[PDB]
Amino acid sequence: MKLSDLRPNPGANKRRKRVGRGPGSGHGKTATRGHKGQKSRSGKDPRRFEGGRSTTLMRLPKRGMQGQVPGEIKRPRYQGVNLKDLARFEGEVTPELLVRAGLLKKGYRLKILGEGEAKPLKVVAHAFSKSALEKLKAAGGEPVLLE
Amino acid sequence: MRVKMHVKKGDTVLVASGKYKGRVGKVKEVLPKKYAVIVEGVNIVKKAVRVSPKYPQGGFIEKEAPLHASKVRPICPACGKPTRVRKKFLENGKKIRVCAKCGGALD
Amino acid sequence: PKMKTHKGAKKRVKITASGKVVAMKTGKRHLNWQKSGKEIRQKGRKFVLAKPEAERIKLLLPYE
Amino acid sequence: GLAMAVADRAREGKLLLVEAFAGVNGKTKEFLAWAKEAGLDGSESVLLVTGNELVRRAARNLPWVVTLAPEGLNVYDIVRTERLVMDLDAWEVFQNRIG
RNA sequence: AGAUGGUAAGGGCCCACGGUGGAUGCCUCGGCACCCGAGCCGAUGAAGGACGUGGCUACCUGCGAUAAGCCAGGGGGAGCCGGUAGCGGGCGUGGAUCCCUGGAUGUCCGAAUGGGGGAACCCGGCCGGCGGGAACGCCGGUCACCGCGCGCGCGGGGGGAACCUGGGGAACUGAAACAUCUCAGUACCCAGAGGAGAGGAAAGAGAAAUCGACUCCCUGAGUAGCGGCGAGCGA
RNA sequence: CUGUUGGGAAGCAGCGCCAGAGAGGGUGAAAGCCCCGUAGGCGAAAGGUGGGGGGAUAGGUGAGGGUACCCGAGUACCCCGUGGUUCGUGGAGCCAUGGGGGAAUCUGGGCGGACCACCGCCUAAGGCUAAGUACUCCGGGUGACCGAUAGCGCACCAGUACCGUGAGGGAAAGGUGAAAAGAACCCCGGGAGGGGAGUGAAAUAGAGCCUGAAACCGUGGGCUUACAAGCAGUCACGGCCCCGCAGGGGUUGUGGCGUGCCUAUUGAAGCAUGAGCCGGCGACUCACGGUCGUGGGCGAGCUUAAGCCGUUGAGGCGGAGGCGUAGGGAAACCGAGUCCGAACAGGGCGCAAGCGGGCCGCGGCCCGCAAAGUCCGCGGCCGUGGACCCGAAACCGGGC
RNA sequence: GCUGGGGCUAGGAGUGAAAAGCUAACCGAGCCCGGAGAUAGCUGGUUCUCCCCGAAAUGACUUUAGGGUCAGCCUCAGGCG
RNA sequence: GGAUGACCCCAGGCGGUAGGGGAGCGUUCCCGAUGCCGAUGAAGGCCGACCCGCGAGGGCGGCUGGAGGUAAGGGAAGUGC
RNA sequence: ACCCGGUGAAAUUGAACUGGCCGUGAAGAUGCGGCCUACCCGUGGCAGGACGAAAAGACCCCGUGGAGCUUUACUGCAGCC
């Protein structure tokens, strides 16, 4: 395997579409922009703009709390993980040991959740849902609850 | 700050290349600004001169054209062989140029 | 430079779990006497925006 | 790639690991000698990988040799060259890179 | 009866060869970009100039009435008296040209500063010299203004591609109109700083029994919020 | 080094050699070994630097008890007017301060987003402080940078010529050859120019100089043309010239046919736009985000950023962080559910995982294959920037 | 009255026996440089070759009406059959 | 049919602006390159009635030109008037 | 003005091998159709035509273009109270 062999698979590299470069191309003259009018010009935001009529968005009404200065309130937050996700572990499970595993995102208080089979496991968590608690306290799990 | 020249007037040199490949002569003259040398009976050229006081009857005169100094190779007075120059710090202790097979001085 | 989320959207719309765009029914912010309780009751419900326009609003929210 | 680059080459008996480097103590002819004795005549081109400063210095100025400390190994310099030649001591760091 | 050919003033097409012109290729003393290094100069008169300066010298370079140069130290080792040949003359291994360092000289203008002035001109005071030298003129020194100190000292003044801080500070434009908003504390003007500048040892952060100067980068995060809750702005 | 072809060798051939140097460039062409170099190494009396080494000096250092002396004033603080911050008057604090009022010295004061109370934080109204940062006139190094319409405006005596009263505007213009060997002398000519001679490997390389395209102008040759009607061509046949020896090439007499190109348009040969002709320059890009698609990597996971180390076209480390793994709700919250509701109706928005094949006494659970996802490459499109290129009338700032 | 010389007044400003006259050969706001590649829903231009398909000039709304958003119609990929 | 782009047979489609898509050509530059072509002649230029390709183009030959050029396969754009 | 000697511009210019009528065609044809007419090339003259040249119509409308002006349009500011 030398240099002249190194080749990218079919369609791994593909030609650009070069417009405005002669009739046979496609693609020439107008350059796929049709005839006249802004959009053919060099240069309006079509996600929002709608022609001077009141937009689709701006006629919808606002909902709920927008928050005000000095902005967002620090309260604790809870990420759930599902009993099924607890599957790969043996012995004791903490939030710490959940993060460093990529199940529980950092700075999130841990809340065990229902979906899945309770494993007879010591699980240390900031919170348990109902059917999570029952399930565990029935497969012989040990639901330590910290603060 | 000086063009480096391996040759001088008028040590004797070989002509390693060109149309005088092999010819031998004493450097008449060195021209650093041109990096080239004048060597006797080497590079001779037919120069047209116009009728003037000195050269009445005008016609042509011969001259030694310069040779690019790279073309020339000093002969060392010991081997009698053309050689690359080397340098030796005497004791004196000035620097001299010395043969590259013999250690003969080139001055 | 990175897109900015349209706040005007963010503040009156939520993208669902399956990718639909949901908003409040219009039609009850005032002028509400003389409207049936049927009308009012229903206008209290979140609805799903026709697909053509759901897609646009979805591009205003690149970081949801 | 490092992995696959070396793999391919080995799959061609072009890979050759060495314990050490006979009498190479810096000098280029010194390396020649050794390479001859090892089946390395310069009919083939060599990526010579060693942390041995002295061996690299000897191999360096060869046209048919591309030299390299082992932390410098890389697929290109492998693919460029016909024959990969490494230290045990380089062979280790290589396997460590791919662990 | 009848029909058909040559003739070219000139023109047309083609072929050949030229003229014109300067494309194309090749070239590169030049430029661009990034990185690194380096980073102030100035009243001991800068930056930038004027005028001069060569045996013969239009320009350029170098130099300053000692004028392509003067004194010394260091480099260096055969050539040299710039780009320049030539006229016409010289120097160099008792080491020249050339390069580095220091020093000397450095007209007149220029912050310009003795005074004046239309920059490179003009005119003075005081002290010393020159000439026959009183009148005259030339040479040398010296003489602005402001801020500090106790008349005397010390500083300042101007310049610098960007970069920096501060004092001021738009509009086009965007909002598919526009006035709040935007462009933007941007452009620009001004003052100051310097090789950087600003900032800098908590009357801080803000929720952790926490952190521990300032700057700067990644992230936080287009999050929190801000907003004719528009365009958009944005910790 | 030698031969060899050549104007010239470094090409080709023979036999050698150096290499910590085979980066590059020169030499008459294509050179490791001829030249300048290159790897590796050495170097300053003088001046500058000196953030590294050392030396010195300034300066610096405790505990309890008591006293209540001091702890930065037109300040803090409050009100009025503003500015800064994400904060546009907003519930508007905090920081700065033009106006008015105007304290206290630790049982003092400011702050933690109006205010209050707790609980905490910090000590305003004096100042200095390296480094990490920015820039690039200047030096150097390197380019999937340009190569004289390019690249700076300037490769060249260019911020010049020239233009403008001025601020200011601002060009064009590079190449003989290896070497000037720059063409003595003769001949026509007042010169310019040219013919010989001469130099040169080459002189349509001769200085108005490498290559020397096209428009354009001539000369000579072939075919053709003075009863002919035209977007100039095409088809056919014929004649004449040419190359050759069932075929080609050139031309064109006659016959048929036939409304330029572009643009803009319902519609153009159009008497609608643009274009004298030729040459050169000229317009869908890039960055960061986004969304599909796609080639790969890995997959309940995937990926690093800035940095650090290494390299001097070698890569590695760095898990901070981001995206994914759960949703629903304005939110508290709850959670495979959740919101509305009195509901244990009803409804909105969500939730179900692959395909195997086998061992074993029905899946126990392996094992493979595939995939959620994500990371990079690629491409299409979108956002933000001048965003395909060229063009206003105008607005604003500072100068003249 | 005309005139030489020396002076002063300028850009929303000057000057004006008034014409919006003059302010360096075009003044309903000088020139130059800069913001600046202002903006231009307008006009023009958009450069190689072959192959497959192939529209629209409608409707709703629109300080819209020679412009746009969505719908209709074109095309490509995957899936359904 | 064969066994997956290898060709053969048979049938059908193949006007086309906006426009969508697909396959190519050529220009500069990088890897390939301490290589290969090159003075017994590079690039570039002028010819051609010859060869290959549907075509863009690519060869081959002659003249000029006198020092460069740059493959198979890939990569990147100041890419075709 | 014209002729001979000397010096010698210009806007314009798709390319031209550039006749009449009657038709026709984007509705006013040298260029289409049919007839008519007409050997080739100039020199001086005239202005009917080439919708002749020149000036991207000044009138007209269009642009959510611009500018000057006005007011008991809006909103501000200087100024005055």
Short mmCIF file of C-alpha atoms (C1' of nucleotides) in Angstrom, two decimals, chain A residues 9-17 19 21 29-31 33 35-36 40-43 45-47 63-65 68-70 75 77-80 82 85 88 101-103 105-106 111 113-115 128-131, chain F residues 86-87 91-92 113 262-265 283-286 294-296 300-301 319-326 329-338 351-353 377-384 386-389:
data_model
loop_
_atom_site.label_atom_id
_atom_site.label_comp_id
_atom_site.label_asym_id
_atom_site.label_seq_id
_atom_site.Cartn_x
_atom_site.Cartn_y
_atom_site.Cartn_z
CA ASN A 9 -14.42 5.64 -1.54
CA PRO A 10 -17.10 6.38 -4.19
CA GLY A 11 -18.90 9.61 -3.25
CA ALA A 12 -16.67 10.28 -0.24
CA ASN A 13 -15.38 13.19 -2.20
CA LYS A 14 -17.76 14.83 -4.69
CA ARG A 15 -17.49 17.74 -7.14
CA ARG A 16 -18.75 21.17 -6.19
CA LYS A 17 -21.59 22.67 -8.18
CA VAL A 19 -22.58 27.81 -11.51
CA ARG A 21 -19.92 29.03 -16.10
CA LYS A 29 -25.93 32.84 -17.18
CA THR A 30 -28.60 33.42 -14.53
CA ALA A 31 -26.84 30.81 -12.36
CA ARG A 33 -31.45 32.05 -9.90
CA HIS A 35 -35.01 36.03 -13.73
CA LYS A 36 -34.79 39.26 -11.72
CA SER A 40 -31.58 36.79 -7.84
CA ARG A 41 -29.88 39.96 -6.52
CA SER A 42 -26.93 39.60 -4.21
CA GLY A 43 -28.80 39.55 -0.85
CA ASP A 45 -34.66 35.98 6.05
CA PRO A 46 -37.18 33.36 4.82
CA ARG A 47 -37.50 31.58 8.20
CA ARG A 63 -46.78 31.45 27.27
CA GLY A 64 -45.64 31.22 30.84
CA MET A 65 -42.74 32.63 32.75
CA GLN A 68 -36.84 38.80 34.65
CA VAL A 69 -33.59 40.51 35.65
CA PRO A 70 -31.38 39.50 37.47
CA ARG A 75 -32.44 25.80 42.55
CA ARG A 77 -32.00 20.17 39.37
CA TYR A 78 -32.73 16.47 39.00
CA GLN A 79 -31.75 14.20 36.12
CA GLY A 80 -33.44 10.83 36.04
CA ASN A 82 -33.69 4.41 34.38
CA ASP A 85 -29.47 1.88 32.64
CA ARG A 88 -24.10 -2.77 33.85
CA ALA A 101 -19.82 6.61 32.99
CA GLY A 102 -21.82 9.19 31.08
CA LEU A 103 -25.32 8.54 32.41
CA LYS A 105 -24.67 14.89 33.62
CA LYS A 106 -22.49 16.96 35.94
CA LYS A 111 -33.07 10.70 40.61
CA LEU A 113 -36.55 6.34 37.54
CA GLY A 114 -38.95 3.49 36.72
CA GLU A 115 -38.20 1.92 33.30
CA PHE A 128 -36.48 8.02 43.74
CA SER A 129 -39.75 7.95 41.80
CA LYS A 130 -42.52 5.79 43.28
CA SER A 131 -42.38 2.71 40.99
"C1'" U F 86 -27.67 41.79 29.77
"C1'" C F 87 -30.59 45.39 32.09
"C1'" G F 91 -39.97 45.25 40.86
"C1'" A F 92 -33.94 48.52 39.21
"C1'" G F 113 -31.29 43.27 42.49
"C1'" C F 262 -26.92 38.59 -26.76
"C1'" U F 263 -30.50 40.58 -23.62
"C1'" A F 264 -35.37 41.56 -22.40
"C1'" U F 265 -40.01 39.65 -23.45
"C1'" A F 283 -18.84 37.74 -11.42
"C1'" C F 284 -21.76 31.82 -6.52
"C1'" U F 285 -16.19 32.64 -2.37
"C1'" C F 286 -14.62 32.29 2.73
"C1'" U F 294 -23.11 11.30 2.21
"C1'" G F 295 -18.04 8.48 3.03
"C1'" G F 296 -16.01 6.84 7.22
"C1'" A F 300 -25.07 3.95 25.32
"C1'" G F 301 -22.23 6.43 24.11
"C1'" G F 319 -12.70 15.43 29.59
"C1'" A F 320 -12.92 21.66 31.13
"C1'" G F 321 -16.65 21.30 28.13
"C1'" G F 322 -20.55 19.90 24.33
"C1'" C F 323 -24.08 16.64 22.03
"C1'" G F 324 -26.88 11.93 23.17
"C1'" U F 325 -29.04 8.60 27.04
"C1'" A F 326 -36.82 10.95 29.15
"C1'" G F 329 -45.70 20.99 32.49
"C1'" A F 330 -45.94 28.45 32.86
"C1'" A F 331 -44.05 26.66 37.08
"C1'" A F 332 -43.79 23.79 42.13
"C1'" C F 333 -43.42 19.29 40.57
"C1'" C F 334 -44.09 14.44 38.92
"C1'" G F 335 -41.79 10.89 35.62
"C1'" A F 336 -42.62 6.01 31.17
"C1'" G F 337 -45.42 9.07 32.01
"C1'" U F 338 -47.09 13.85 32.34
"C1'" C F 351 -43.23 5.82 26.37
"C1'" A F 352 -42.34 -0.43 23.42
"C1'" A F 353 -36.40 -1.78 20.11
"C1'" G F 377 -14.36 14.37 5.71
"C1'" C F 378 -17.46 15.60 1.52
"C1'" G F 379 -21.39 17.90 -1.02
"C1'" G F 380 -26.61 20.73 -1.46
"C1'" C F 381 -29.00 24.56 0.81
"C1'" C F 382 -29.93 28.26 4.92
"C1'" G F 383 -28.47 32.06 8.81
"C1'" U F 384 -24.74 36.13 9.97
"C1'" G F 386 -19.98 43.33 1.08
"C1'" A F 387 -21.99 37.20 0.60
"C1'" C F 388 -22.68 36.62 -7.37
"C1'" C F 389 -20.16 41.21 -9.84
#
